[model samples]
Target: PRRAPAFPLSDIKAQMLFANNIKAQQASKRSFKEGAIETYEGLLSVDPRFLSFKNELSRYLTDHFPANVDEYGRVYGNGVRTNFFGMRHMNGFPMIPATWPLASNLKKRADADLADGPVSERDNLLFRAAVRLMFSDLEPVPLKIRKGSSTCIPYFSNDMGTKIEIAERALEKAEEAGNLMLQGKFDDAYQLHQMGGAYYVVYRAQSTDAITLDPKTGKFVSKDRMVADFEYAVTGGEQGSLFAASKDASRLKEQYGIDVPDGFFCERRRTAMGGPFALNAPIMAVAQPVRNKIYSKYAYTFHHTTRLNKEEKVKEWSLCVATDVSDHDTFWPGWLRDLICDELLNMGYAPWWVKLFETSLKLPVYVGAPAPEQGHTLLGDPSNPDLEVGLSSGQGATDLMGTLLMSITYLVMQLDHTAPHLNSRIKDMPSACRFLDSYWQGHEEIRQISKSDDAMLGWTKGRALVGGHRLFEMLKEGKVNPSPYMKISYEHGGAFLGDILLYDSRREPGSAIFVGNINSMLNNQFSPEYGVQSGVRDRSKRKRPFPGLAWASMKDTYGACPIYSDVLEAIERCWWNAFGESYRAYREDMLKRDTLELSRYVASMARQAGLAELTPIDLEVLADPNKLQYKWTEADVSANIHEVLMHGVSVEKTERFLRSVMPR
Candidate 1:
């Protein structure tokens, strides 16, 4: 992930002569040449326990390069299969295997140590320029070389604007010949491609193929088929392990580490072998700590509310709703605006006043559009085609329509109190309630106005109605603002006093939720106002249900946290009653369901987010939990049970005592 440093050619030549292959490159130091070969042979001489290396090395020697053979077998074959870390990439470029990380580092290091002089200046600059061009031209070169004929034919397309104009021209000519059924031309083009590909060879080994020229259109002759003539072998760091180096790197104590021994080799070959990773580590470490410092300084401000102390509850129901989860850009700016209102509400400002302020604004939606799909490359590329959006319910972002829909969703979320909904059933309320007597009174106009598709007006009214529905549900649960999304919706809807509550005795089988604010008088003998307005001298006032439930506010009610709390209590209560393995069956049942359903949902959402495959539970992350750990076996589940018991128990009859003054 780190950037490579720029360097000159004399250094690379020296490294080739001294560090890498002096004999093969035909350099001066005989001992160095023999030492390099011996070092390599010595590595091979050791017992070959490393299977990943052995498989790849053998494949390169016998099937891919075949040094003894005059010509490669790619003449009668197809290009290699491309994959990265076991995942398949849509791009044709193969993944940069784990084997080449070391070689790439060595190349960069060698380039950095180049010498300079006037005589070699022009040629040196030219060579340096060519290598740079070559590196960028072919990205993600394979670590293990393979012999294969590609379906693609090279076109002699000249990009005349580069600094290395001559080299580019020669490449173009070579490509033209290869595409024209000329065997010698194909060979030349293949060689050029190989040389160009060395730049990111490490990453390329694990990536999918990326080239997309139409080889079918070009002249094709079996005899003209060309096989690549280059080494795809890997070196240090690619295997996720360190390699033995000729000299000890620990000696650079002041530069590396104070405690490092004089001959200490770094744990990573990429670092110890000589590259930018080591050079930057010490300096970067000082400038930036291992822990991310950015998040520690995030700003936070709190707003206190006087409404929290108010005992009054609304006599009628009012609802508010808005959504921002579907879009990220519209979220934060609006959230900051809400933060301002958090203080304003304490100043006694009305909720409708806030709604008027949030109606106007716009924000950016980066990556709003999906990349191209099948048969269509991104905007400019020819070979890569944009995939069809409708294939998976138009879930992909690369296609035009899906991008546009997401854009629309982003715009919708900008509205304050515009709460998100997962299904269409939630929006069916206004129509169902239009005929009610309540519709003809104050809300009749809103009911009629909701019929049309006037964007702003529709969203505003729709949010209010939706907010009303959600608020009612929260009220019955005896939880205030149970959902994070619904809480925001209330703010946007202007329900600063909180949601309306309605109770359903049987539907929910207990105290049930209804949207909007509601105030009720306890005891059958009651007036609109309790005790003050209508003084009841009824004997029923002495009864528990009548007098106790007679007057109560139902708003700001039950919550999911309470439900989870209950589950926790259940675990503890049952543990004390039955304890130990007695509840094993119940724990297993819940875990099985959580794993099967919850895990699937997570995977589906990830796929929706455009990730190919994700393994969230890995060995390295702290406190990592896998299927086995979650199997009613881990101690966390027992700890969760104990935590649940921390919340005080609630009595059924005492609910009336608390609800008398609470809003519905």
Candidate 2:
């Protein structure tokens, strides 16, 4: 029965359209079946606050299918000239889109086979082949004792481009070393890593002055920069204590053309231990640029206790490497880079009503319902900074709400048709399928009902978004909610959907809190004091779990180009014109009802300079649909929303949302 605010509808719609345009542009390049499946799964991950739009999404699905089912009972295509789901905008090269018939049949086959057991033998082979094709270049290095297992293995069950490059670089040095041995060119070739086309040999040691910085300027010392090229004695090795032997130094110089300075021994710093053995030994290593300009560089070391074999003596030791990228970026794809550009980044600035009163937004509103089930309760967080900033001032929580809104709309449109295909299709492409499968595994409730009744699918999906399906359904049945098809306007002129996605619910505690932690870690790793710890210290034991790997491992992770203040300024002005008074009133009422602490936190964050104001005339110009610069079509919105909900939302979406809404 609750209704969203009514002022910034136009701007909200514009923002939604703009973000959706980017998503649709990315999704269209693939096949309709592929895109649809991807979009549908993507929608499921959306915060359920926007579940009222289920009918609009359903209508789009019914409209998108061909007029009639073919003899094979598969829908042919949308009436569009191109397969509605496919596009070749990436140059002239056309990609193979998944055919509806093929996709449907694949689903039918998978369903029939899976009912009997796990996966059919044929399906297993297909899945394996797909994975193989995706990771064809991956190589696993075998260990001596465990003949079948690999000491070094390339994990390409996600994006292939970066992992392939890393593996090739590692193996290239080993190959070069082998060839040198054949020709008697050198005695041994040290392991090397390549980045941005540059190669560097890696080594480890413990000594004094391991890393030095200019005390006054805080820049790394010249000697520290060349640590990548040095070779020092390993702990308790034949060479004795922390000494850089001439033979080892010369071997690197002769074989790899690296120049190590004379008497250059870097000291290891101790951290967190009772003695030298418990020492967090500082790592010393050297680097060399191969054919490319090395604009930036970094070195890292990890100290831990390890034994050579099962029965071998345990020794205190450390492993060090100097590389161009972070460990997170090196093993996987360019995750950080990709996150900088996700569309959800902009949604961090959602309206206030959406941030308060968990029940009104229709989120899971059950707490101790006696029977015990996951549902909504009052949404509040003392640590949340967005609450203090005048809910209109965009914040990460609001941005997250926007992301959920778009995702919910997308899910409502595609899940009915796409869920079955996605559930079956990933059997063959784990690299592509891993995230989707994991998502289903984690949130089996959404996946289960989606495969059965269309209404139930929408209901469950809504339940996830709004706290309860009954509340979402009440809105859907025309009790008091906004129009389902009012895309883009929900957060602008329509009611603000609370930050249910960011709020800690029984199902996912501190989900939003984790986003702030990720931003803090990502941005501060370059700091002088914490830089080493940020880069070298293990994050596995952090206070709260970070979502970095989750975003990086997914193929269709959320990302987008930066959203500037100018765009937001216009959006802000547009919203003020429509509901400035209502927003102020709503904020006062909501702060009193709930989110009091969150409001204070946001108010504290409001100390920064205010956003630039737009002219009233400019606001009028924005009202002109053409002047608004809205780029996404209704169909585009449908496609993108479907893709993410169907596939899944990742931490990239969180980072992107943060970057987009947070002022530069």
Candidate 3:
């Protein structure tokens, strides 16, 4: 019953057109017959939250397929195939892994046949090809890891453990499922998909199992032990569709780029300490039917850990699409057509797939259940200034939020459907899929710098955000000399001043003009302070010891551009007749601000009246958008100045007039 916020009109319109077509329906039936089966089994279980979406899913299934099972099996293969029941019975609802499940089954066939021994060379060659086909199809698809961290990972560490246990438990339930299926218990098998994200719950269980605590290094183990989790074991669909190659050692070497013999030994050693090593292991092989028939590996097994903070746990689950446009057949096959149509909704990217969430938004966005789950809560932390790490340059939570809101609002206004394919397909609209992809991208270093360790936040006891209390402690102890938090005040001050320059630039006119005063003040203000602390210390790399200092001195990045104020004034005159009072206040504000600056500069020059007369300067030499200023060896600030005779006055006459009025 709970709904996410309504999709923007543009995104909704595109999705409905996408969802309703008969071909899309058949594809859903084809894909969901495989993907949704695992979801159905436990819908009516004690989990009241997922229990509710049954009607929605059933309607999704029935509307896509005919009312009868025979009709459903006609387009798709017969529901009673050995592969279907065998897999369901094996993996316990047949959830597929993200790797190619169909090929994994073939690898099983070739290995089984080859292991029989004394086979002819031709047969051996054929089996070798099959094994290669299987390995190639099921090889691990590369994942684009957008790095970040939060308390969320540690909280779910326990739930992740529980999920792994449940997944193993599901394999045990496979026999019960198989018995029911053989004795005309088709309804029971189908019921699995209708259950609360049953397939997802279990798949996530397997996924979480993959996360482990390594005793030696005191960090999570690498690609080695991570293979043990049930989630990692599941691979198929677009992921596994590549198993048609020569699986012989050399062929695998040529194809996979990783040596099979070495990869195999590494895997065997891993399996000794872990669960299943190879994607084609017997346990995974036996689970194919349940994988293809009842559940989508893309939906259930693929998961992303949304690290909220150290204390909070947030895991977002959804089906990831194969945006992987590899070789001919690997592109969206007719059978895998629904996989192409499936709306990807998750926190971040998956292997070979461009996540919709990341592509559409400028910042990270997270979506969750309408109602919060028990004992699970969302935590809030305002972005803070950290002195130890030079985090003062990054946008604050308020600036971040405002920028996100402004972008979302603009996107809502000009939903660009006219752009290229993938971007056009991402819907923010209505009726089809209501979920927003909270796609986030980051590097490891950036993630570390983003962590907030407040005692109230409980990141760890000793470490916390250095706050006002800490400031008082430092002042009392006189230990604040080398402060990490000073840049916070400075950068935030720049942000405020940046806004003021933005207002001034709006009043100017001409080709690419820089708001020099604001730009120069900001540059000299922030560079030396935070830049050194950020590890960007080398001047050779930055052309200045303070690389931040160089950027501050540069005419670009820190500089403001000229706004065509003359054109703006022309346009304003057309509207001024209708809104006199409002325009009057706006014009008054601009004039008042300009006068204030002019007066202050004049007063500062007064101290050295005779020795240092106030000089007129060209703003372009100070801040040019183009680095032409830096490149020009003979450029002079005075030579660049141009004189113009005003309609009512002249620069020479004005200078003479000023000299005459001087207190001689």
Query: What are the runs in model 2 whose C-alpha is more than 4 Å off?
Result: 1-229, 232-326, 329-427, 430-610, 613-664
Specify the highest-lDDT model's number.
1
lDDT of 3 by residue, 1-664 (tens): 1111222213432122122445433321222111111211222111223212221222222233221112111111111111100000101111222221111122222322312221233222222222221122222211111011000110111123333333333333433433443344433532341101000010111111111224586432213221111111122221312321111123323533532221111100100001111101112322222122211222111111111221121111110000100111111111111111121212121211111111111111111111112111111110110001001111111112122222221112112211112233333332101111111111100011111110010011121212322432333344322121111111111111112112122221111121332222322321111112123222112111211112223233233323223223332443254334343354345334433332322334333332122121223222221121111111122321211100112234323322222222
Q: How far out, in Å, is residue 263 in model 2?
A: 27
- Per-model clash counts, in order, read 77, 78, 43
lDDT of each residue in 1-664, candidate 2, tens digit only: 1111111213332112111343322321222110101111122101121121221221232234313222211111221111111110111111121000010111222222212221233333322332222212212111101011111111111223332333333323333432432343321221122111000011111111212234587333312221110011111012222222121122334533534333222122111101000000000000001000111110000010111110011111110000011111011111111121221122232221112211111111001111112111111111111111011101112222222222222232233223434334334344333533333232332321110011112212332333233333333343332212112111110100100012112212112110111111111111111111123122221111121212221111111101122222332343355434342343334323322221222333233322123222121221111111122111222222122111222334323332322323
- What TM-score do all the candidates reach, one by one? 0.16, 0.16, 0.17
Question: Tens digits of per-residue lDDT for model 1 on 1-664?
Answer: 2222222223341222121333322222111000001111112111122213222322222233211111110011111211111111111111111111221222222233311221222222222222121111111110110011010112111122221232223222322422321222322322343111011111111111111212486321111111111121122122334322222222334542323211112111110011111111111111111011111111000010112211121122232122212212111122223333343343343332222111111100001001112110011101111111111110111111122222222222322223434122213223222222222122321221110011111112454556545443443343442322211111112122222122222221023232322111000111110111113232111111011111111112212111223323443443345323333354444333323332232324332342123221111011112111111111212322212111111233223321221122
lDDT of 3 at 557: 29
Candidate number with the higher TM-score (1 or 2)? 1
The ten-residue window of minimal lDDT in model 2 covers 277-286
On TM-score, the stronger of 2 and 3 is 3
Instruction: Sort by lDDT, best first.
Output: 1, 3, 2
Over all chains combined, what TM-score does candidate 3 have? 0.17
